[PDB]
Amino acid sequence: PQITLWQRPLVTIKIGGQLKEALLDTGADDTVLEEMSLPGRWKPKMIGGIGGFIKVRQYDQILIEICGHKAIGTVLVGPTPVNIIGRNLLTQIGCTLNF
Amino acid sequence: PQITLWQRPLVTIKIGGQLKEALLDTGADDTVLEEMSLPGRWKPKMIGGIGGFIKVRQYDQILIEICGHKAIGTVLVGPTPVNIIGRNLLTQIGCTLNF
Ligand SMILES: Nc1ccc(S(=O)(=O)N(Cc2ccccc2)[C@H]2CNC[C@@H]2N(Cc2ccccc2)S(=O)(=O)c2ccc(N)cc2)cc1
Ligand SMILES: [Cl-]
Ligand SMILES: [Cl-]
Ligand SMILES: [Cl-]
Known part of the structure; x- marks a missing residue:
């Protein structure tokens, strides 16, 4: 698709057999x-947002379908x-920014 | 341009006579x-994400050059x-997501 940004670019994903909006x-x-x-073991990870860093759970090699x-x-x-699809999977689906 | 997501999509902007990375x-x-x-009137706003919220000043009708x-x-x-260019300005330059 080509997705414009007048609204949030919210899409349907599927993970663990479940549909979700992300x-x-x-x-x-x-x-x-x-x-x-999610299945398997997780490892610790810190991610930084606008208000500082927080600890989240990292699961590797997880199957997920995006649009x-x-x-x-x-x-x-x-x-x-909100559920967020970040650059690590956007690259996998071949997503680019264009103007 | 077509911008890849292998890395952060960082661009140069010009605002208030200043060059910045965003x-x-x-x-x-x-x-x-x-x-x-920035010139003109402003009003406070709070924006937030993982990590929590921060207080910012909102300026309207500001001119910016993006790439x-x-x-x-x-x-x-x-x-x-981090300096962030959001959807409110990405729409104006014609920016879309594509895959
Ligand atoms: N990996 C990763 C890193 C950061 C985050 S986040 O900070 O939660 N987050 C997601 C989000 C927050 C609020 C609403 C919708 C999306 C960030 C990432 N993109 C948008 C958002 N922001 C830009 C950002 C912040 C830190 C690092 C890099 C970019 S933001 O600053 O929180 C923000 C939030 C609300 C508005 N109005 C404007 C901007 C999430 C995942
Ligand atoms: Cl990955
Ligand atoms: Cl605006
Ligand atoms: Cl448009």
Whole structure:
């Protein structure tokens, strides 16, 4: 698709068999989802937002579909304001900025 | 331009006679820059994300140049750890997400 930015670029994702809404965020280096259950072991990770750094859970090599496009990569889980697809998976689906 | 997301989409902007580096951020509703002076009236606002919220000053109808493209819009100024170009200005330069 070509997605304009007059509104938030919210899209449907699928992870763990579940559909969710997430924001395509080119400012986010890393994908971060709201609290949920994922398989395997996790590792600690700090991410920095506008108000400082917080600790989230890092799960690697997670299958996730984004607007119908398949990805497998790192998914962080924590108290994000909204589900966010960050540059690590936007690159995988071949997303670019254009003007 | 077509901008890759392998790295942070950092561009040069010109605002208030100043050259600055800023992130093209599709997750940001608003443009938010580190502390600087801008002309005209302003009013306070709070913006937030992971880490919490910060207080900023809101200036309207500010002229900014982004990668050579001129635009007009609201700029927020405050203690952000990164200069952010948000959707309110990305729309004006014709910026889209594409995959
Ligand atoms: N990996 C990663 C890093 C940071 C974050 S975040 O700070 O939560 N976050 C997501 C978000 C917050 C609020 C609403 C919608 C999206 C950031 C990332 N893009 C937009 C948002 N921001 C830009 C940013 C902040 C820190 C580092 C790099 C960029 S922001 O400053 O919080 C912001 C929030 C609200 C408005 N109006 C304008 C700007 C999330 C994941
Ligand atoms: Cl990854
Ligand atoms: Cl505006
Ligand atoms: Cl348009």
